[PDB]
Amino acid sequence: PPVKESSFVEKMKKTGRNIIVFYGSQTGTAEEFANRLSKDAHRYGMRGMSADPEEYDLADLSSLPEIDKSLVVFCMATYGEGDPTDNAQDFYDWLQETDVDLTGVKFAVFGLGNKTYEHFNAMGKYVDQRLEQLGAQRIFELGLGDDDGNLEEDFITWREQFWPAVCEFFGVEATGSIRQYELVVHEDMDVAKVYTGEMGRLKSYENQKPPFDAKNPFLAAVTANRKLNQGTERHLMHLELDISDSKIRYESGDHVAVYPANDSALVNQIGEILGADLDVIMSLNNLDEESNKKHPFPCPTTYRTALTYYLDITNPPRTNVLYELAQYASEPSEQEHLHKMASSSGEGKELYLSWVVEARRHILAILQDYPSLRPPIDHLCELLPRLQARYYSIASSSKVHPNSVHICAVAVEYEAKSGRVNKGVATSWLRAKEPAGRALVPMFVRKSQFRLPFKSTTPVIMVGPGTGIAPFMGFIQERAWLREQGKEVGETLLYYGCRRSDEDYLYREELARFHKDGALTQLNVAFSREQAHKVYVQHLLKRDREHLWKLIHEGGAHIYVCGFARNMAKDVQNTFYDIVAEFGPMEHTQAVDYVKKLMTKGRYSLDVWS
Ligand SMILES: Cc1cc2nc3c(=O)[nH]c(=O)nc-3n(C[C@H](O)[C@H](O)[C@H](O)COP(=O)(O)OP(=O)(O)OC[C@H]3O[C@@H](n4cnc5c(N)ncnc54)[C@H](O)[C@@H]3O)c2cc1C
Numbered sequence: 001p002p003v004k005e006s007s008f009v010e011k012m013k014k015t016g017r018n019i020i021v022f023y024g025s026q027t028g029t030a031e032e033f034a035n036r037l038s039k040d041a042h043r044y045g046m047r048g049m050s051a052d053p054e055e056y057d058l059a060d061l062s063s064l065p066e067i068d069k070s071l072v073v074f075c076m077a078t079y080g081e082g083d084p085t086d087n088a089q090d091f092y093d094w095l096q097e098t099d100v101d102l103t104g105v106k107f108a109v110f111g112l113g114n115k116t117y118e119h120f121n122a123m124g125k126y127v128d129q130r131l132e133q134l135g136a137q138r139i140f141e142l143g144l145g146d147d148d149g150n151l152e153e154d155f156i157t158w159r160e161q162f163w164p165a166v167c168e169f170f171g172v173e174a175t176g177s178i179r180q181y182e183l184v185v186h187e188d189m190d191v192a193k194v195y196t197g198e199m200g201r202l203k204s205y206e207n208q209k210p211p212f213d214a215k216n217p218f219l220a221a222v223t224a225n226r227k228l229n230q231g232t233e234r235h236l237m238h239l240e241l242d243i244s245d246s247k248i249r250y251e252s253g254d255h256v257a258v259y260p261a262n263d264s265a266l267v268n269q270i271g272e273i274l275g276a277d278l279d280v281i282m283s284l285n286n287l288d289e290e291s292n293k294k295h296p297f298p299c300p301t302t303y304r305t306a307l308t309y310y311l312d313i314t315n316p317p318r319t320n321v322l323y324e325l326a327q328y329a330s331e332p333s334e335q336e337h338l339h340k341m342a343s344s345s346g347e348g349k350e351l352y353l354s355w356v357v358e359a360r361r362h363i364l365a366i367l368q369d370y371p372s373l374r375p376p377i378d379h380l381c382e383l384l385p386r387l388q389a390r391y392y393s394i395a396s397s398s399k400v401h402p403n404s405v406h407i408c409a410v411a412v413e414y415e416a417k418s419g420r421v422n423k424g425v426a427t428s429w430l431r432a433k434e435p436a437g438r439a440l441v442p443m444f445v446r447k448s449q450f451r452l453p454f455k456s457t458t459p460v461i462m463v464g465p466g467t468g469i470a471p472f473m474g475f476i477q478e479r480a481w482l483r484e485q486g487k488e489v490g491e492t493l494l495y496y497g498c499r500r501s502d503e504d505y506l507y508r509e510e511l512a513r514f515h516k517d518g519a520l521t522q523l524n525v526a527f528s529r530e531q532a533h534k535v536y537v538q539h540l541l542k543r544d545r546e547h548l549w550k551l552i553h554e555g556g557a558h559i560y561v562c563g564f565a566r567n568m569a570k571d572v573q574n575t576f577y578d579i580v581a582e583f584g585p586m587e588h589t590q591a592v593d594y595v596k597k598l599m600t601k602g603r604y605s606l607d608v609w610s
């Protein structure tokens with residue numbers, strides 16, 4: 001229940017703006033595009049602004065025609081079941097209820113989707129179709145960005161054609177380095193007025209007061225951090241975060257989010273190579289005193305702190321960041337390279353995709369491989385995108401561990417084609433937390449729809465290969481609990497998979513116990529590498545087809561699938577089609593409808609992380 005800002009049309013009028021770009025984003029991709037489009041307004045004699053549809057009354061769209069050459073653009077990402085992003089929720093519901101007339105409104109839509117989902121860019125497709133039905137006229141074709149390929153490139157391609165169309169329609173042409181903030185170094189700063197990594201209110205990390213959430217995370221102490229796998233090929237860990245006194249509620253199936261810190265050595269190095277003093281206390285105030293975002297991140301603060309807690313310094317810099325940096329490359333060929341990274345075709349496009357994206361070169365890596373690139377630290381901090389929270393499937397039951405949130409994660413570390421060893425931000429940070437001054441992890445809980453059945457007699461079929469075992473340790477703790485409580489619990493099956501029982505069989509002992517005690521009716525483990533051929537969880541599902549069909553069709557069984565690989569989820573889904581087709585019996589097509597029907601009925605749940 002946020003307090004809506006005043007009419008954005010009136011705001012546009014007052015600031016002389018004629019184009020507004022709204023973003024339907026969840027993890028910032030769409031926000032960045034909207035901001036990039038809004039910044040483009042200038043290059044064409046127009047003045048724009050970006051905005052969060054949740055903070056406004058979209059009904060005011062009907063007043064947009066009161067501004068000459070007015071235009072509204074929508075950058076929307078599609079989520080769970082072709083649903084809108086949280087922030088675009090009210091807009092979505094509204095578009096369904098309203099009879100409002102938008103005659104004279106000119107709009108354009110760029111959708112962010114993926115093709116590896118049942119409803120590709122549903123949101124974008126809807127916003128674009130609905131706006132026309134209400135009477136608004138499309139000024140440029142709907143953009144169907146695909147994140148399965150390179151969304152960034154699609155955006156660039158769409159955009160390179162968007163503006164010429166807009167210029168042609170409105171009768172305006174092009175006009176051939178604009179900074180969003182100004183630097184204000186502080187000399188006398190009461191130490192108590194300097195942000196040191198809090199996400200929200202000053203000193204909120206130190207003075208913790210409920211309720212806790214994304215904007216006011218609870219600093220949970222790590223009471224446990226142990227190695228889960230037996231071998232050393234990889235490092236899988238299990239942590240326990242104490243949420244006592246936080247008044248935080250959670251149930252198995254929910255995800256726990258964390259705000260990490262970047263590697264100090266990496267931060268230190270970025271400062272070193274630029275010759276900048278990371279310990280300078282300062283602020284970056286928006287040059288547009290009209291905007292609401294007065295700072296790119298909590299200020300005043302030091303660079304070190306920004307680079308440490310507020311900025312992303314590990315993922316590959318996007319085209320516009322490289323483009324704005326070119327100016328700081330004292331070597332011609334390098335300045336040229338950076339400048340051409342944003343090309344929509346040719347060698348320039350090939351270089352960004354192979355040398356930047358594919359090689360996973362972070363900013364420091366680019367500063368090293370292009371020795372002439374020596375930008376001022378403050379302009380860099382303005383260009384780098386914000387550091388995001390990382391999510392994890394809570395690996396414990398709140399009925400058994402009401403005061404603790406468990407995590408099961410695989411540490412990320414790999415060789416990038418850039419030649420260096422890339423480290424996962426959150427997993428490295430977590431791996432380093434020792435129970436000891438106790439080690440704290442800023443966190444919060446995100447409710448999900450991944451839940452055990454309400455009726456305890458209902459059979460549960462769990463499929464979780466590798467790290468996907470995470471949410472299931474909670475389910476098993478819970479089901480075992482329901483039994484201890486004397487209640488009647490139906491069958492609980494676990495289809496787990498790993499490479500070798502002696503390499504990475506997670507929770508081998510715990511699972512063994514649950515099975516012996518009957519908490520786990522069946523412990524089916526696929527050891528993918530203990531023989532020449534691959535053996536995965538679906539092969540076991542196929543093996544037990546007769547019993548699973550009995551549990552599903554006549555037992556009311558609920559199915560759960562969790563893990564990284566989207567392909568694994570598809571393979572598992574395919575096996576269920578075949579099981580249903582065989583024992584119905586029924587044709588493949590009907591088996592597909594049957595299984596997809598289990599989903600819409602809440603009997604087939606997924607928690608895929610890719
Ligand atoms: C809802 C949800 C639930 C999840 N649950 C868990 C969980 O419970 N347990 C768990 O282990 N993870 C889980 N994750 C993944 C987790 O959120 C993080 O993405 C993961 O821990 C890595 O984060 P990080 O900051 O350590 O690495 P980051 O710095 O975020 O780097 C991640 C990126 O590195 C790149 N990358 C990784 N390996 C390679 C490679 N070898 N070659 C090239 N590029 C590579 C990819 O772009 C990958 O996206 C879940 C994710 C989501 C969204």
Ligand SMILES: Cc1cc2nc3c(=O)[nH]c(=O)nc-3n(C[C@H](O)[C@H](O)[C@H](O)COP(=O)(O)O)c2cc1C
Pocket residue numbers: 024025026027028029030031077078079080081082083085112113114115117118119120121122147151
């Ligand atoms: C949990 C989750 C669910 C998604 N569901 C869909 C979907 O149904 N359809 C689709 O086209 N894309 C889907 N996507 C892909 C996103 O729309 C795409 O990655 C978008 O770039 C994210 O933008 P954002 O960072 O602005 O939220 C999903 C991504 C996640 C993480």
